[PDB]
Amino acid sequence: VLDRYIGKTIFNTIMMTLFMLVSLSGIIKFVDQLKKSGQGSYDALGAGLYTILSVPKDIQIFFPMAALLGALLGLGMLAQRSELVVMQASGFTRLQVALAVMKTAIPLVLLTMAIGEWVAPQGEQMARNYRAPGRYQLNMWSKIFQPLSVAVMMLMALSFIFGPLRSVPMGVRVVTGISFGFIFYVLDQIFGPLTLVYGIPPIIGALLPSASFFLISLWLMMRKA
Amino acid sequence: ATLTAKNLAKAYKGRRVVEDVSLTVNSGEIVGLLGPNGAGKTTTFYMVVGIVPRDAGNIIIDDEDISLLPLHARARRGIGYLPQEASIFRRLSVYDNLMAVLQIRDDLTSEQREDRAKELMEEFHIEHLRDSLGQALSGGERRRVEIARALAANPKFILLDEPFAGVDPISVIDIKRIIEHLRDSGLGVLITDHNVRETLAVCERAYIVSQGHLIAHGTPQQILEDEQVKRVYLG
Amino acid sequence: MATLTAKNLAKAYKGRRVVEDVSLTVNSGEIVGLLGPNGAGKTTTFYMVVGIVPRDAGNIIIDDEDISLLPLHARARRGIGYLPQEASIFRRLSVYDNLMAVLQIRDDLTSEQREDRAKELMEEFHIEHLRDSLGQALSGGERRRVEIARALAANPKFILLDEPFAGVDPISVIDIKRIIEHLRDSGLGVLITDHNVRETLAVCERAYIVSQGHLIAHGTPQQILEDEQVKRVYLGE
Amino acid sequence: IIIRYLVRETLKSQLAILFILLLIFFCQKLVRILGAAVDGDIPTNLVLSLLGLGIPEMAQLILPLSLFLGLLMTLGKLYTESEITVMHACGLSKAVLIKAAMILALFTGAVAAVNVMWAGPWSSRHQDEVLAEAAELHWRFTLVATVFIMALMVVPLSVVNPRQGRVLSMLPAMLLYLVFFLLQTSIKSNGGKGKMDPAIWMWAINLLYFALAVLLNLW
Ligand SMILES: CCCCCCCCCCCCCC(=O)O[C@H](CCCCCCCCCCC)CC(=O)O[C@@H]1[C@@H](NC(=O)C[C@@H](CCCCCCCCCCC)OC(=O)CCCCCCCCCCC)[C@H](OC[C@H]2O[C@H](OP(=O)(O)O)[C@H](NC(=O)C[C@H](O)CCCCCCCCCCC)[C@@H](OC(=O)C[C@H](O)CCCCCCCCCCC)[C@@H]2O)O[C@H](CO[C@]2(C(=O)O)C[C@@H](O[C@]3(C(=O)O)C[C@@H](O)[C@@H](O)[C@@H]([C@H](O)CO)O3)[C@@H](O[C@H]3O[C@H]([C@@H](O)CO)[C@@H](OP(=O)(O)O)[C@H](O[C@H]4O[C@H]([C@@H](O)CO[C@H]5O[C@H]([C@@H](O)CO)[C@@H](O)[C@H](O)[C@@H]5O)[C@@H](OP(=O)(O)O)[C@H](O)[C@@H]4O)[C@@H]3O)[C@@H]([C@H](O)CO)O2)[C@H]1OP(=O)(O)O
Numbered sequence: 012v013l014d015r016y017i018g019k020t021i022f023n024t025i026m027m028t029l030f031m032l033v034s035l036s037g038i039i040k041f042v043d044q045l046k047k048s049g050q051g052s053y054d055a056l057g058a059g060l061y062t063i064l065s066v067p068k069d070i071q072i073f074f075p076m077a078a079l080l081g082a083l084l085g086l087g088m089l090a091q092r093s094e095l096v097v098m099q100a101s102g103f104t105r106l107q108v109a110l111a112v113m114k115t116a117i118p119l120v121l122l123t124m125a126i127g128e129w130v131a132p133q134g135e136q137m138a139r140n141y142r143a144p145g146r147y148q149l150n151m152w153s154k155i156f157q158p159l160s161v162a163v164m165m166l167m168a169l170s171f172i173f174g175p176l177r178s179v180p181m182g183v184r185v186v187t188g189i190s191f192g193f194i195f196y197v198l199d200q201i202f203g204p205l206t207l208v209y210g211i212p213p214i215i216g217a218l219l220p221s222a223s224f225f226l227i228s229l230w231l232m233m234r235k236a
Numbered sequence: 237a238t239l240t241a242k243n244l245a246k247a248y249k250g251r252r253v254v255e256d257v258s259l260t261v262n263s264g265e266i267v268g269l270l271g272p273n274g275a276g277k278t279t280t281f282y283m284v285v286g287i288v289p290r291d292a293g294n295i296i297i298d299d300e301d302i303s304l305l306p307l308h309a310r311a312r313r314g315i316g317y318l319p320q321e322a323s324i325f326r327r328l329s330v331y332d333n334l335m336a337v338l339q340i341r342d343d344l345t346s347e348q349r350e351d352r353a354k355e356l357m358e359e360f361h362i363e364h365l366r367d368s369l370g371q372a373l374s375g376g377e378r379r380r381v382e383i384a385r386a387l388a389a390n391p392k393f394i395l396l397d398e399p400f401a402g403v404d405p406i407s408v409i410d411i412k413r414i415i416e417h418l419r420d421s422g423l424g425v426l427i428t429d430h431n432v433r434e435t436l437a438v439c440e441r442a443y444i445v446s447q448g449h450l451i452a453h454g455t456p457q458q459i460l461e462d463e464q465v466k467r468v469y470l471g
Numbered sequence: 472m473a474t475l476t477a478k479n480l481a482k483a484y485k486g487r488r489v490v491e492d493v494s495l496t497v498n499s500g501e502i503v504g505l506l507g508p509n510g511a512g513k514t515t516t517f518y519m520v521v522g523i524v525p526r527d528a529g530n531i532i533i534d535d536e537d538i539s540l541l542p543l544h545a546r547a548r549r550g551i552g553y554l555p556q557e558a559s560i561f562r563r564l565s566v567y568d569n570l571m572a573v574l575q576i577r578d579d580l581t582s583e584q585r586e587d588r589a590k591e592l593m594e595e596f597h598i599e600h601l602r603d604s605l606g607q608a609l610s611g612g613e614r615r616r617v618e619i620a621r622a623l624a625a626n627p628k629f630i631l632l633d634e635p636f637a638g639v640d641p642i643s644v645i646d647i648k649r650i651i652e653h654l655r656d657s658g659l660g661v662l663i664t665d666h667n668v669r670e671t672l673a674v675c676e677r678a679y680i681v682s683q684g685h686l687i688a689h690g691t692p693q694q695i696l697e698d699e700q701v702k703r704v705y706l707g708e
Numbered sequence: 709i710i711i712r713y714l715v716r717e718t719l720k721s722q723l724a725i726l727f728i729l730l731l732i733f734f735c736q737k738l739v740r741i742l743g744a745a746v747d748g749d750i751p752t753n754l755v756l757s758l759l760g761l762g763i764p765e766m767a768q769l770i771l772p773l774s775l776f777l778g779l780l781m782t783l784g785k786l787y788t789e790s791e792i793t794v795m796h797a798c799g800l801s802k803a804v805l806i807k808a809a810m811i812l813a814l815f816t817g818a819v820a821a822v823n824v825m826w827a828g829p830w831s832s833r834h835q836d837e838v839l840a841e842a843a844e845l846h847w848r849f850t851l852v853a854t855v856f857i858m859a860l861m862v863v864p865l866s867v868v869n870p871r872q873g874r875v876l877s878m879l880p881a882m883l884l885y886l887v888f889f890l891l892q893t894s895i896k897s898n899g900g901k902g903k904m905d906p907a908i909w910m911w912a913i914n915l916l917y918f919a920l921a922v923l924l925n926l927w
Contacts, residue, residue, distance in 0.1 A: 013336035016328045042894045093321035096287065097382065099308045100317035101389045102340045146746055180788075182874030197735035204746045235289065236306070272640050375509075404508040405668050406707040430639045433669060469642055523793060542927075543796035553797035555790040562789060563720075564713045572710035573798035618794075625799040 013103055017089075018115040024085025025119060025165075029069060029077045036068040037061060050142065060141050067135035070127035070157060071150075076196050078119070078161040080188035082112055082168035087184040090176055109169045116165045120158035127157055145207055153203060153218040163224045164195060170231035195224060237263040237298065239314070239393040239424055244283055244293030254280050255448040257293075259426075261393060266415065266425040268435045268442035271452075276445045278397075281428040285317045285395050286310045297392065312340070314392025316423075320401050324370055324378050325385075330357070331366035333381060337388040356384040360414070375403055376410050383414050393424030400429045412438050473534055473550065474498040475629035475660050477520045480529030490516045492529075493686040495679040497629055502651065502661035504671045504678035507705060512681025517664045521553040521631050522546040533628065548577070552627025552659075556634035560618045562607045566598060569606060569617070574624035589624065596620050596650060611638040612646065619650055629660035636665045648674045668706060680705060710800065714808035717786070722778025722816070729774050733766040734759065754838045761838070764831035767823035769889070772854045775816045776885060779809060779862040780878050787870050787877075802863065802925065809859035817855040824851055843905050847896035850914045854892075857914070858885060861921040888917050 041064070044056040056064075069077075086108075089095045099105060171187060179187075202220045211217060240260045247253060254276040261267040271277045282288040284295055286307030294303045295310075302310045311317065325333040334353045338344065344352060357363035360380040365373070373381060379399065386394055399411050415438055418425050429435040436442060436456040444452040444459060452459045459465055476496045482489055490512050497503040505517040518524040520531065522542050531539040533550040547553065561569040570589045574580075580588070593599055596616045601609065609617065615635070622630060635647045651674060654661055665671045672678060672692035680688035680701050688694075688701040695701060702708065741758050744750055750758075783805065786792045796802065828848070862881060869877035895910040 012328075012332050013339060016325065016332070016336060020327060039890060042890050045894055046897050092326060093319035093323040094325065096307075096317070096319050097323035097385065099306075100285070100311050100315070100319070101337045101385065102308050102312035103337075104312075105306055105308055180874040182878075185875045193732065193735070197739065200739040201735065201742050204742045207746070208752055272642075273638060402509055402666060404705060406508070406703075406705055409707060431667060432641060433667075471642075471645060521797065523797070543799075544801040547797050547799045548801075551797075553794065555794055555797070557790040559790050559794035559797075561710070561713065561791060563717045564710075568713065569710075572713065573795075573800065575709065576798070576800050576804075622794065622798055627799075 013098065013101075014107070014111040014114070017086075017098075017108065017111040018118075020089055020094075021082050021085050021112045021165075022115045022119065024088065025078055025081030028081040028084060029074060032073050032077045032080070033065050033069060036073055037065050040064065040068070047142075055141075060138055063134035063138035063141070066126065067131045067138070070123055070131045071154065072196070072199075074123050074127075075157070075160045075164045075199075076192045079164035079167050079171075079192045079195065080185070082165055083171050083184055083188040083192075084181070086112060086168055086172045087176060087179075087181065090172060091181045091184075095172070105173060108173075109166070112169060113162065113165055116162050119165070120161060123161055124158050127154060148213060149203055149206055149217055152213055153199075153221070156218055156222060159222055160195075160199075160218075160224075163222055163228065164192070167191065167195075167224050167228045167231075170228045174231045174234060191224075195221065198224075237314070237392045237422065237424065238296070239284070239426070240296050241280075241284060242294040242296065244280060244290070244295070246279060246283055246288060246291040246293075248279075252448055254283070254445070257443070257445055257448075257450040258453075259284065259443045259450070261424045261426055263392065263422045263424045264419055265441065266419050266427070266439045268432075268439040268456075269426060269428045269445065270430075270432045270435060270442050271444040271446045271450075273430055276448045276450075277430075278428060280445055280450075281395065281397065281426070284426070285315065285397075287317075311389065311391065316386040316389055316391030316394035318379075318382055318386055318394065318396045318399065320398045322378060322382075324373055324381055326371045327369075329366065329370050330362055330368055330381050330384075333370055334384055334388050337385050340389055352388070356388055359387075359417070360384045376407055379411060379414060383418070387418070387423075391423070393426065394418055395426035396428070398429045399427060400431050400434050405434070408434055472499045472658065473628045473660070474532075475520070475550070475662070476532045478530055478532075480516055480519055480526060480531070482515065482519060482524070482527035484515075488684055490519075490681070491685045493679075493681055495520070495686065495689070497660040497662055497677075499628060499658050499660050500655055501677060502655055502663065502675045504675040504680070505662060505664040506668055506671060506678055506680045507682040507687070509666070512684050512686065513664050516681055516686075517631070517633070517662070520662065521551060521633075523553070547625065547627065550628040552622045552625060552630040554618055554622045554630065554632050554635075556637045558611075558614055558618075560606050560609065560614050560621070563605075565603045565605045566593065566601050566617055567603045570621055570624055573621055577625055579626070592620055592624055595653070612640075612643055615643075615647060615650065619654070623654070623657070627659070629662060630654050631662040632664070634665050635663060636667055636670060639667070644670050710795070711804060711808045711811060714782075714804070715812040718775075718778050718782040718808070718812055719815075721782045721785075722774050722812075725777045725781065726770065726774040729770045729777065730763075730766070733770055737762050737766060754840065757838055758835070761831055761835045764823045764827040767827065768820070768851050771816055771820045771823060772851070772858055773885070773889075775809075775813060775855060776858045776862050776881075779859060780866055780881055783863065783866040784870060784874070784877060787867050788874060792867060805863040806860060806925070809863060810856065813855050813859035817852050820852050820855055824848055843900060843902060844896070846906055846910050847892070850892060850911060853914060853918075854888075857918050857921055858888075860925065861885070861917065864921075864924045864927070888913075 041061060044060060045053055048056065199221045203218050206217050238260065241258050244257045245254050257276065257280045269277055269281045279288055283290055290303045294301065297314050307317065328336065331353065334356055338349050338353055357366060360383060362377065362380050362384060365377065370381065399415065400408055403411060415425055427435050427439065439456065441455050442459065443450050444465065451464045452462050474496060478494045480493045481491050493512065493516050495503065505513050507513050515524060519526040526539055529539060530537060538546050538549060561572065564572065567589065570593055574589050575585055598616050598620060601613065636644055651661055663671050663675060672695065675692065677690050678688065678692060678695060679686060680695065682704050688698055738759055741755055745755055783792060795804065865881035865884065866877055869880065891913055892910065895913060896906060899906045
């Protein structure tokens, strides 16, 4: 049961965080549609464009950036109420918490890959139709590595909640999630297009620095043991 | 059953916040870790529990080393730690909360595990809170769920981190009564509360630590005979 | 001489009656505690005496003048001095700068005496050696010498200390009582709201205890222990 | 005065957020540049220059937000230390927060003016050629008036919430800030380049916030 409670806490925080951040993404880009309004209709952009405007922003961008911010705010919200320490002081294994949260990423990658194969390219391509290689290859392989990125953002939260938690204020964790969750962002749109500039072969590198958060999550897991 | 420490010492970044402190607690022997705050009282306590990793000392239960062992591995054997904060499993009911922890004890079968859950629920008079969400409970109620939860892991020694933190002195009887049941069973208490005037009335013997090194070890009656606290603590 | 008279004070949070009519009066040279079960009446009735949390009903009168409506913008300017439980000391400022900082806001002082009093106030609490000592470089034991010294640098009456015994070290308890004696000797009322009961009464001449949102006790600590209503809800022997 | 300390803490904190906001806005502008680098095949020789040429473009958005984020974090941390709540308990008024902000917002505003009066046009003309070839004023003017408004707007939006949330105090201040900026950015749409000017609502919304700034400050 204690793992199921971890699931709702960690999974509900990830889902709610994704929803609030998606609302922000919508209206911040919605006002962008208001800027492009006058082609024929803005209220239609409010209804028809908005729904298929929201779903894509999660998978390529706001899902993993909010995935870290979901557990690192959530799994640290338990340690904010001293739930985690009592969870560990009751003998729930530290390697079982990572076996608990990451096991709740299996229901979360399915809610990402299936929302990134059947409605992210089907809806977004439908969303721009409502407004009437060097590039693709890098992206496509990266979009296959999308489940690994949220599984690593969720693995970065475990190290950030078992390593640098240091009885911090929840606020600090949020900006840690805001910052590394933004570091993961810049490392996904700068390093990813830079791949062709430095000639990093897709067969070997491409978006791996984005998934090299693992190596940034592996020096943050054994550092103090 | 013992929870002994050998020459414990630790520096956060080189300040030597604790220097050669040894604490020994036997089952049924309530012990208090009293003294100046931030001077080593909490850090030595947190080093025993496992929150602060061990540096140069050594903690032993009976003969098994638990120095490198983290909290949970130490906890899975005999250690039950009660945090200062709430830790009431806000989004989980008390029935589930106890049964969630009880699942850690692997040797206990599910059919008997439910009886163990009912045993603790009626042991701390929180059985009627099985349907309660657990989000909000009174200071009397809140600690009883935590203690039941900690007692559910069936530890050998339980360490209370300021059980008398921000509590009205009429509930100090309730909190001490919760401590009284822990000593009534084959359990070892370790209180770390700063209210020395309220903790010391419960402990058989206490280790009082100051400026890094423990200076007083024994019953509070013996502490009053110690000149350090009678001249530099009281006057 | 001067009196901090709080009457009829009451306020309901979200509609729930947090505190009902409480009548608490403290004069210069009197030390009154604000004690009771946590959350019942303290930390909400006490603050409204200070003015931090706004008051919903009641009236506060000091120097025969009402201040109940005015927040610390004028409540602290006239006759009320509040000291929080945590580290209110100006962390990134030096002691000969932070003392004058609130000493120089009050226009009712010549600048020559303004620079003088800080020298005279700093020596009062044995802070002379801690002259330009930057803040954040002081222990919690001295955090209070400067914290009280600063809150004293406004000519405030009825210095309300908010939980002076937060970092409870029983040698700090003796020290804090000593400096509170000076504040009482400074011809000021004192209003303490410390968590523990057994030590505050050792320094309080009177103690207004508020429980269940309704003020219950007042007067000498000896008078307090013989009352059944407070004992059965706060101490219980 | 304590006001000098209030600024010196804020300025030492704003100058740190300014670097942090510079990095955050560096990445966004670099992502847009890198995206255009792979789309328009813009040579890598001058992509760094473009990043260092859009700084005034970002400056309009960060210089108010660096003071604001500085004000929010400084007043956040000062209130988290329960220092402001004694700063009023010791006889200073909330005007001390305002006067501390303004005596430091005049600085940021003056720099904001420099990024508006000179560096703005300076940035664009260098941004036009970059050796490659081998109205607005209502938004331009409200940028300075934004700084004074937000410094007036931050001081009431950080001292009632931190009782329960360290960062939850920033959210209403940030969201009310964001609703200002995007709406201000939204309005500067009709009647742009040229002499045509937007209808009278950009300063109508902007002046609304000033009224909303004073409204909750006078408490
Ligand atoms: C806590 C502490 C706080 C931290 C700090 C805060 C951080 C803030 C970050 C902001 C940094 C950047 C600042 C900024 O961004 O600044 C401005 C922003 C202001 C606010 C920012 C600060 C906030 C306040 C301060 C903070 C307070 C808190 C915006 C801007 O800048 O405005 C505009 C900009 N908006 C934004 O950027 C939104 C902003 C939004 C910012 C959001 C901030 C959020 C903070 C949250 C705080 C939380 C607390 C509350 O940022 C983004 O989102 C970027 C992502 C940012 C995220 C960063 C990470 C955040 C992490 C936070 C935690 C650390 C917008 O496009 C950007 C979109 O791109 C992607 O979408 P897409 O992929 O594209 O879909 C993004 N997708 C994404 O990123 C991906 C994802 O989604 C998002 C992922 C993000 C990260 C995810 C994870 C995050 C981490 C999470 C961790 C927890 C979208 O994302 C979106 O949707 C929004 C998105 O959902 C939301 C964002 C999500 C954020 C979430 C954060 C959550 C955090 C929570 C925890 C903290 C994004 O919206 O348009 C312009 C740029 O396009 C330009 C360019 O200039 O480059 C201009 C083009 O013209 C366009 C236009 O697009 O406008 C298109 C045209 O087709 C047409 O339509 C035209 C008109 O409409 C026509 O009517 O308009 C065109 O030009 C030229 O092209 C051609 C040229 O080549 C010649 O051939 C010409 O022909 P043509 O070929 O035909 O085109 C063109 O001529 C046309 O016009 C002519 C006439 O008009 C003449 O007029 C002339 O003059 C005019 C000038 O005078 C005008 O000045 C101009 O019109 C021209 O010059 C023109 O010449 C006609 O002539 P005539 O014939 O008529 O004569 C002509 O024929 C023809 O029609 C023209 O010349 C072209 C280029 O030039 C080519 O050369 O591209 C910008 O204007 P500009 O830049 O100012 O110019």
